[PDB]
Design a protein around this ligand. Structure first.
Ligand code: HEM
Ligand code: HEM
Ligand code: HEM
Lengths: 727, 727, 309, 83
C-alpha cells in the first residue's frame, strides 16, 4: 500500500465547506478545534489510526489480513486461526436492539447558554447564570420506522436533548408537536402497536396509512388533536432545523424558596419553520431516504449550525384550574395567545459525532432524568414514561451500567454504593458498598436540599383520593383543540391537511373505518369533514351535517402561532439552489448568481446531464456536482437556469422534468435569457407569473426577487395551477 | 453523620501487616505505592469516595437515601421515584453468568521478569531482555464448583496468568497437574457433565465423589492419569502459593530464524510444595470455605508475595517421536528425569485488586491469546480449546467488546477495523472501517513477520492425511503414566492416594461402578488395587491378580519430581502458628516464641476461650485474635502452648480438642512447662515422641526444633498412631 | 457398547424407597404415576432418551461422538466440524445469572387444597372449594450465598410457593421468620450489600459473621428483630420440612361484597419444628454442603412428603 | 447466540426440527426441553449409553465426513488458481 492519491484529494479539508464540496468526515477530523467540556472528556476513549499497525483486539500485530489459515493454499480452514475468529466474532455481534420507538434518528453535539439568571423561578444550576455554558447532545428522530427506514416520512418527530449540567444530566425528551396522541401511558403499547407495521406481515414501514392506525384513531377520539398535526405539513418537515420542539407535559420549576411554577418547554427554530409538501416528501423517501440525516450533518460541516431558542410557558400554581382544559392532559396544548412563551436561552449544534453507532446509536435519554430545580406533575402519560426508559435501556444497551457508555456519562462527579452489573467499567475503591457505614466514615454522603449544590427533594404536592384505575373526567373533551388547530391554519395549510387525511384513509382497506374517521372529523369541523368525505366518495348524513362544533378554547377562535406560515419567519441561510448548466454557460449570469447566493449564505449545486466538467463562455471550467437525475429537484429549495447554449438542454427530458417537479412542489424558479424557453414546459404565461423570476440576464434585481421568493419558502399561490401539470 | 470511631481504628494501616492484625482492604488503599504499568493504566477508571456527595448514576445529589417517595408517610410508593428505581434496578442486574468451569477463583496483580534473554529460542518480546518487566494478573481456581463453592475441596486447580506484553496479551492458562483427564476437546462437555453436580438434583457441589464421575472414569481409561493426581494430596493443596502449575500442552517457541522448538510450560512455587490431608481439607470447607482466597489475600497484605519460577521443558523438532508416548497427548506428562525444566524467569504477586467483581469476576483469559514467538501444536485437546474461550466470553461478559473491560485491556496499542457491538467504549475516528482502503491511506496497516515488532505468522507445519474423526493410535495407552506417578510417591503419599479412591468410591451408590474402577486400578498396580478393594470389601479375582503391569516410561521406574515431599522444598515464611493462651501466660515463653517466629517470617494467632484480652504474668496486655472454636487448628500449620496458669484451660473441651485435631492432621505441636499436661490428651509417651516439641520453658532449642518440624510441613511418621485417636 | 450391568442394578426401582437404598433419579422416572395438572402439562416438553439415536440439535445423527474432525489422525482440527462446534457452543453457553439473593435453593412439585370454602372473606378461586386442588411448585432457599454455596449455614431461609390457579398464578413469596431486617425497599441494596461477601475480596460466603453486616446492624436498630431470629437456632434448621414459613407483610383478602380484611400468611410444618446446633451445622457445611437439598429430595423419594398447613 | 439470546435457538418454534433430536446438551438461557435422561454424558452405564451413536450407512445412518485428502503447510495464503 499507498492507496491514497498523491494529490491528497482523498481527505476533506478541516474547515467549513458547503454541502457537496468535499467528502463528509468524523467531526473530530473535520472540525478539530470545535470543543466543549463533553467533547473534551470523550477524548480518553477516542481512537486514531494513522501510522498505527493493524492488530487483534489483544494488541497482536497482523501480518496477512487477506487470508484465513489453511492446510495447503487450497485446503480447509483451520480451527487454530484465532485472528480470523476474533475478526469474524466481533463482526457477528455488531448489532444491538434498535429503540422500540424512535429507532430512526440523527444526532449532533452542541452547547446551551441561558439569556439571564432564572434563579427567581428555578434553582436549576444550568439556568442560573448566562455565562454558564452547558454541553448538549441532541438526537432528532421519527417515531414509527426502524433504524433503516426513511427520513422524510409523514410522522411525528422526536427532539431529545441531553444537558450535561454541573449538578447532573437533565434529558429534555420532546417531539415536534405540542401534544401527544393519548392520555394515559397504559395505552402506549396499544397506540404504538396500532401505528407500527401490522403483525401478520410487518407492513407498512414508516407510515400510519394503514387500517390498524385509523381503526385505533376512530375508536379513541383523544388521538384526534395529534392526528391533526400529523396530517398537516407539520408531519413532513423540510429539516430538523426548521421544526419546533416541545416537552409536551406540564412539569414544575422549583426555586430556592420552594415555590413551584408549572412550565411547558419549547424550542423555537432560529432557521424558521418550514415543511415539504406530501408528493415531494414521499418521492424523497425513495430518491434519498437519508435526506434529513445528511442535511443536518452537512449544515454543521458548512457552519449553518442548527440553533434553537429555549422557551418556557409559565403558569402559577393558583392558575391550575383556570383553563377550559386540564393542564395535566397531554392531548391539550396551551395556546400562546393565553400563555406566551418566555425566551430563556439558546442552544447551538456545532459538531457532528465521530462514530454514529458509538455516540448516536448507544445514546440513552430519559424524561425521568431531572435535576434539583425541576420536578414532575401528575400528567398520567408522563407518569408512565418515568418507568419505561430505564427498563428499555437494560436490554437495549445490555445492562445497568449504560451510564458508563462514553456518550451517556455525566461530566460532573457521581459516587454511590451501586456495584457490579454486566460490563462494569468503574473500579470502586470504597471499603463500603452500603450506607450507613462506619468503615468509610459514611462517604459518599447524602446532602440536604438547598439553594444550590443540594440534594434532590420532591416538591411536597398534596395527594388525596382513592386507589383507582380511572380517567379524570376533566380529560374527556376531544374536539375543541383539533378545531382551534384547524381554524388557525392558512387556506393552503387546511388543504394540505384535507389531502393528508384523504390520502391516508384511501389506503385503509376496510371502508367502515374511513367512514368512522369521517364521522369524527364531522365533530371537529364540517368543512374539513365534507372535503375529506368528498375525496373518499362518502356522503355525510343529515345528522352529521347538524353536529354542533365544539366550543372555542377560552374564547379563542384561532392562534396564529399554530400555523407554520401565517406569520413570516423565513431564513434563507443554509438553503440550497440547483443551477442547471449547459455546455456554454454565460459566465456573467453565473457570477451574478453565485455572488448573490453567497451574500445570503445560500448554497448552490451545479447540475448537468453527465459528470466531469463543462467550460463556460469565458473559458471558466465548471465542475459538475451531480446529474439532473442524480440530484432531483426534491433535494433543493429553488431552481435557477442561467443563459448560454440552451439548445444543449432544451430537449433533455430530465432537464424539463426537473423544472416540472420543482414547479409542482411550489418552489421558486428563475430563468435567465434564453432559459425562458423553458416557460413552455411549465405552461407559464407570456407575461409572467408570481413565483417565476425571468429577465434578459441574471442581473441586479433578478437575484433579489429570487431570494425574496426563497425567504417565503414556497409559492402557495401556484396551488390551483399545479393540478393540471402531468408531473 | 458520624460514623467512624474518633480513634481512627476503622481504617487499616497502609503498610504490610500480618494476617488478622487489621481489617483487609482494597489493594490501592492498602498498598498505594505498589505500582506496575497495568496498575497505573487502571487509574483512569478507579473511583474514590471520601468527601464526595452521594448521587444517582447521572450525577444528581441524593438528599434522603433512607426512604422511598410515597403519598403520605404511610402511603403507597410512587412511580415517579426515579432515585429508588435506578438504585433497585442496578441492584436487580448485578449478576452475570459465572464461568462454565473454574467459576471459583481468587486473583492478584504482580509482575514477571526473565532471568536472561531467550532470543536464541523465541522472538517473544516479553522474554527478550532481563530488564524488561511484564505486568501480570493471575487467577487461581478450582474446576467443578460454582463461584460460591468452597476453596479446600478435592479437585484440580486452575492457574491462569495474563501477561500484559508490549506486543500483545499472552494468556498462559494452566492447571496444577501436568496432564488433563481427556484427550480430545470433543469429549470436554461429556467429562465436565460427569464431574459436575448430577442433572436431576444438582448434587454434589465441589466433589468428584459421586456415581457419574466414576462411571465416566471406569469407561474412559484415558482419565486415569489425572485421576491419580486428583486422588493424591495434590488435589488438596495447602495454598495457591504451595502448588505447581503447568501449561499441560506441548506448544512451540519460534525464534527469529524461524526455528520451532517444542515447549511445555511450568511454574515452580518458591514457597515449596505443600498439601493438606483429606480430613482437614473436608472439615475446612465447612469451618472456612474461603480459606485459600483469604490466605492469598493476606499473604500479599503481609508482604509474603506469592513467587513462582517460570520453567521450560524444551524438545527439539527432531526428537518428536523419540518417547514411548506421544508429545501431543495431554494425558501424558514429560518426565523431568528425561527432559529437565530449564529456569526462565520469576513472577511475583504483590497487590490485591480493588474490586473483586470488576477485576477478578470479569477477567477473561484464553489459551489462544499468544504473541509472535509462540505457536500452537496439533494436541487435539488444545485445538478445541482455541474455539471455546472466545465463544463463552460473548455470553458471560455480554458481547464482543470484553477486551475493553478495564482488567482485560492490553497496555500496548491496539487498532483495527472492528466496530460496534454491545457496550462499545472505543470511539473510532478512522474514516475507513475496512481494508484495503485509500481514504485513510490504508491505516492501520499490516506488518510483515520479523525478529521484533513484526506481524504474527503461523509456523508452516506440514499437514498430511485424510479428513477423519479418529483418535491417533499413539494415544491409545492409559496405564503406564498412572503407574509411573504411583511408584514415584512416598509410602505415606501412596496411602493418601489409596484413601482418596476409597473415600470417593464409597460415595458411589451403584456397586458395579466401584468394581469397574477397581478393575482399572488392577491394570496400573496390584498393590494399589488390592488396598482400595480391601477398603471397599471387594476381592480381586485370579485374572485381576495376574494382569501384567504396564511397562516403565522410557525405562524409568520412578521420578521423584512427581512427589510433593520426596525431595525437601519446605519454606516456613508465611506459615502461621496457633498459640493457645491461658489467663496468666509466662511472658518469657511468649517473647521467646514470638521473636523466633518473627525471625523466620512465621505468623502467630493468639487464641483463647473468649475475645478481648488477657494479662501476662508481668502485666503485658495480650489482645486475643480468636477463640479456640472460632479459629480451628485446621487454619494453622502448627500449635504452641506456652506455660502460665495451665489449670485455666486444662479442662477446656475446645482447648483439648484443638490439640487432638492438630495432632490427627500431623501438625507439629510444642508444649512448654506445665503445658506438657496436655500430653495426656494426645496420649503421648512420657519419654516424648518425634513431632512433639517439649521442654521446661520455651527457650533456646525449643523454637529451633519447632521450626525444623515446620520446615518439613507435617509429621508423616505419626500416621500409624493417629488411627486410634477419636478426633 | 456398553452397558448397564446385566443385573439391571444401574436403575432405581420406580417405587418409594428409603434414603440411600437406591440411586436417586428424575421424578418422572422415580414416580411415573404421581400426577397433577401442572406436572401433566409439562409433558409436552419432556424428553426421553432410551432407544433414541444421538443427534445434533438439528436432528442429524452422529456417527462418532468421541473425536473432532482433523486433517489426518494426528492433524489440526478443521473449522468444518459443525458437530463439534454445536456441541462445545451449547456447553459454552450453559450458565445464566444466578438470583441476586436466594441463589442457593431446592425445589419440588406438589398440590394444595383448602379445608373449607373461604368465600366469606375472599373471592380468591383457589380458596373457594375444599375439593378444588391447586398444583404448586415450591422453592426453598438460603439468602446470602451463591447457587454453589452450602445448605446448613446460619442465614434466613426463603420459602416460595407458586400456586397454579384457575384464575392466574399466585406466588406466595415468604421466608422462615415472620419479619424482615429492614423497613423500606430503598434500603434493600444497602442491607444486602452489607450481608453479602465484602466487595474488595469477595469474602465471606454464606455468612453474616463479618464486619460489614454488623456495622450495618449497629447503625440500623430496625434490623435487630430479624437479627435475633437469625442468631437463634431458627437460623440453622434441620430440614426445609421442619421450619415455619411466613409471608411477612400484611396483605389483604377481598370478598365478593368488596370487604377488605388484613391478612398475614403462615405455613405450619406438619413434620414439626426442629433445628441443628451451631457446631453441627457449621461442620455439616463441609461434610455435606448439599444436606438440605439431598434430604428434601430423598424424603420425597421415600414417601415422607413435606406437608405444611 | 446474541441475535436469538442463547444456544437454545433450535427450540424457537419456527426453527425446530420435525424429526427426533436427543443428545447430552443441557441448560442455556431459555431452556424449553426438560430432559429425563439420568445421564448428561457419554459414554454412560446409568442409562445404558442412550441416546446412542449410529454408524454411517445407506439410510438413517450417522454423519461421517467424506475422507478428502489434505496435504500442505499451515499457510495464510490465497491459491494462485484464484488469481
Ligand atoms: C409526550 C409523550 C412522549 C414523547 C414526547 C416521547 C419522546 C420520545 C423520544 C424523543 C424518544 C427517542 C429518544 C432518543 O432519541 O433516543 C423516545 C423514546 C422512547 N419512548 Fe418516549 N415519548 C413519549 C411517550 C412515551 C411513553 C408514554 C412511553 C411508554 C410508557 C414511551 C417509551 C419510550 C421508549 C421505551 C423509548 C425508547 C428509549 C430507548 O431505547 O432509549 N414514550 N420517546
Ligand atoms: C489442558 C486442558 C485445560 C486447561 C489447563 C484449562 C484451564 C482453564 C482455566 C485455568 C480456566 C479458568 C480461567 C480463569 O481463571 O478465568 C479455564 C476456563 C475455561 N475452560 Fe479451560 N482448561 C482446559 C481444557 C479446556 C477445554 C478442552 C475446553 C473446551 C473445549 C475448556 C473450556 C473452558 C471454558 C469455556 C472456560 C471458561 C472461560 C471463561 O468463561 O472465560 N477448557 N480453563
Ligand atoms: C419480606 C421481605 C422479603 C421476602 C420474604 C423475600 C423473599 C424472597 C424469596 C423467598 C426469594 C427467592 C424466590 C425463589 O426461590 O426463586 C426472593 C428473591 C428475590 N428478592 Fe425478595 N424477599 C423480600 C424482600 C425483598 C426486597 C425488599 C427486594 C427488593 C426491593 C427483593 C428482591 C428480590 C429479588 C431481586 C429476588 C430474585 C428473584 C429472581 O431472580 O427471580 N426482595 N425474595
Amino acid at each position: 500500500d499507498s492507496l491514497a492519491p498523491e494529490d491528497g484529494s482523498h481527505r476533506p479539508a478541516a474547515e467549513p465547506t458547503p454541502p457537496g464540496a468535499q467528502p463528509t468526515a468524523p467531526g473530530s477530523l473535520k472540525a478539530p478545534d470545535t470543543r466543549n467540556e463533553k467533547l473534551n472528556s470523550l477524548e480518553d476513549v477516542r481512537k486514531g489510526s494513522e501510522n498505527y499497525a493493524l492488530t487483534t483486539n489483544q494488541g497482536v500485530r497482523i501480518a496477512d489480513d487477506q487470508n484465513s489459515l489453511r492446510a495447503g493454499s487450497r485446503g480447509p480452514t483451520l480451527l487454530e486461526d484465532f485472528i480470523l475468529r476474533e475478526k469474524i466474532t466481533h463482526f457477528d455481534h455488531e448489532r444491538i436492539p434498535e429503540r422500540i420507538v424512535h429507532a430512526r434518528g440523527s444526532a449532533a453535539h452542541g452547547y446551551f447558554q441561558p439569556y439571564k439568571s432564572l434563579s427567581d423561578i428555578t434553582k436549576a444550576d444550568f439556568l442560573s447564570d448566562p455565562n454558564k455554558i452547558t454541553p448538549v447532545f441532541v438526537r432528532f428522530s421519527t417515531v414509527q420506522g426502524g433504524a433503516g427506514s426513511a427520513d422524510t416520512v409523514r410522522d411525528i418527530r422526536g427532539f431529545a436533548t441531553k444537558f450535561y449540567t454541573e449538578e447532573g444530566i437533565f434529558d429534555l425528551v420532546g417531539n415536534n408537536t405540542p401534544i401527544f396522541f393519548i392520555q394515559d401511558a397504559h395505552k402506549f403499547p396499544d397506540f404504538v402497536h396500532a401505528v407500527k407495521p401490522e403483525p401478520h406481515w410487518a407492513i407498512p414501514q414508516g407510515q400510519s396509512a394503514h387500517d390498524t392506525f385509523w381503526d385505533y384513531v376512530s375508536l379513541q377520539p383523544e388521538t384526534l388533536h395529534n392526528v391533526m398535526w400529523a396530517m398537516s405539513d407539520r408531519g413532513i418537515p423540510r429539516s430538523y432545523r426548521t421544526m419546533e420542539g416541545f416537552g409536551i407535559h406540564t412539569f414544575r420549576l422549583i426555586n430556592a424558596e420552594g415555590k413551584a411554577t408549572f412550565v411547558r418547554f419549547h424550542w423555537k427554530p432560529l432557521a424558521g419553520k418550514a415543511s415539504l409538501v406530501w408528493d415531494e416528501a414521499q418521492k424523497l423517501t425513495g430518491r434519498d431516504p437519508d435526506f434529513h440525516r445528511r442535511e443536518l450533518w452537512e449544515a454543521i460541516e458548512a457552519g449553518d449550525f442548527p440553533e434553537y431558542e429555549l422557551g418556557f410557558q409559565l403558569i402559577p400554581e393558583e392558575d391550575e384550574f383556570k383553563f377550559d382544559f386540564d393542564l395535566l392532559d397531554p392531548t391539550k396544548l396551551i395556546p400562546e395567545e393565553l400563555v406566551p412563551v418566555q425566551r430563556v436561552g439558546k442552544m447551538v449544534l456545532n459538531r457532528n459525532p465521530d462514530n454514529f453507532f458509538a455516540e448516536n446509536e448507544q445514546a440513552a435519554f430519559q424524561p425521568g432524568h431531572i435535576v434539583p430545580g425541576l420536578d414532575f406533575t401528575n400528567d398520567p402519560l408522563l407518569q408512565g414514561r418515568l418507568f419505561s426508559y430505564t427498563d428499555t435501556q437494560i436490554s437495549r444497551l445490555g445492562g445497568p451500567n449504560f451510564h458508563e457508555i462514553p456518550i451517556n456519562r455525566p461530566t460532573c462527579p457521581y459516587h454511590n454504593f451501586q456495584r457490579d452489573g454486566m460490563h462494569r467499567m468503574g473500579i470502586d475503591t470504597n471499603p463500603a458498598n452500603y450506607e450507613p457505614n462506619s468503615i468509610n466514615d459514611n462517604w459518599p454522603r447524602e446532602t440536604p436540599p438547598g439553594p444550590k449544590r443540594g440534594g434532590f427533594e420532591s416538591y411536597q404536592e398534596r395527594v388525596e383520593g382513592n386507589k383507582v384505575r380511572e380517567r379524570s373526567p376533566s380529560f374527556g373533551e376531544y374536539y375543541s383543540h383539533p378545531r382551534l388547530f384547524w381554524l388557525s391554519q392558512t387556506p393552503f395549510e387546511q388543504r394540505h391537511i384535507v389531502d393528508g387525511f384523504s390520502f391516508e384513509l384511501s389506503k385503509v382497506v376496510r371502508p367502515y373505518i374511513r367512514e368512522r374517521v369521517v364521522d369524527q372529523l364531522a365533530h371537529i369541523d364540517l368543512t374539513l369533514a365534507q372535503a375529506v368525505a368528498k375525496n373518499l366518495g362518502i356522503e355525510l348524513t343529515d345528522d352529521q351535517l347538524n353536529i354542533t362544533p365544539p366550543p372555542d378554547v377560552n374564547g379563542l377562535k384561532k392562534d396564529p402561532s399554530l400555523s407554520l406560515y401565517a406569520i413570516p419567519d423565513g431564513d434563507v441561510k443554509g438553503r440550497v439552489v440547483a443551477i442547471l448548466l449547459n455546455d456554454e454557460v454565460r459566465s456573467a449570469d453565473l457570477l451574478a448568481i453565485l455572488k448573490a447566493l453567497k451574500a445570503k449564505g445560500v448554497h448552490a449545486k451545479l447540475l448537468y446531464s453527465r459528470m466531469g466538467e463543462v467550460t463556460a463562455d469565458d473559458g471558466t471550467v465548471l465542475p459538475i456536482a451531480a446529474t439532473f437525475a442524480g440530484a432531483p429537484s426534491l433535494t433543493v429549495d429553488a431552481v435557477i437556469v442561467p443563459c448560454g447554449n440552451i439548445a444543449d438542454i432544451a430537449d433533455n427530458g430530465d432537464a424539463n422534468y426537473y423544472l416540472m417537479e420543482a414547479y409542482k412542489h411550489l418552489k421558486p424558479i428563475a430563468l435567465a435569457g434564453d432559459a425562458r424557453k423553458f416557460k413552455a414546459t411549465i405552461k407559464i404565461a407570456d407575461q409572467g407569473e408570481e413565483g417565476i423570476v425571468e429577465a434578459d440576464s441574471a442581473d441586479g434585481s433578478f437575484m433579489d426577487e429570487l431570494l425574496t421568493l426563497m425567504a417565503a419558502h414556497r409559492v402557495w399561490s401556484r396551488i390551483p395551477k399545479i393540478d393540471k401539470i402531468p408531473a
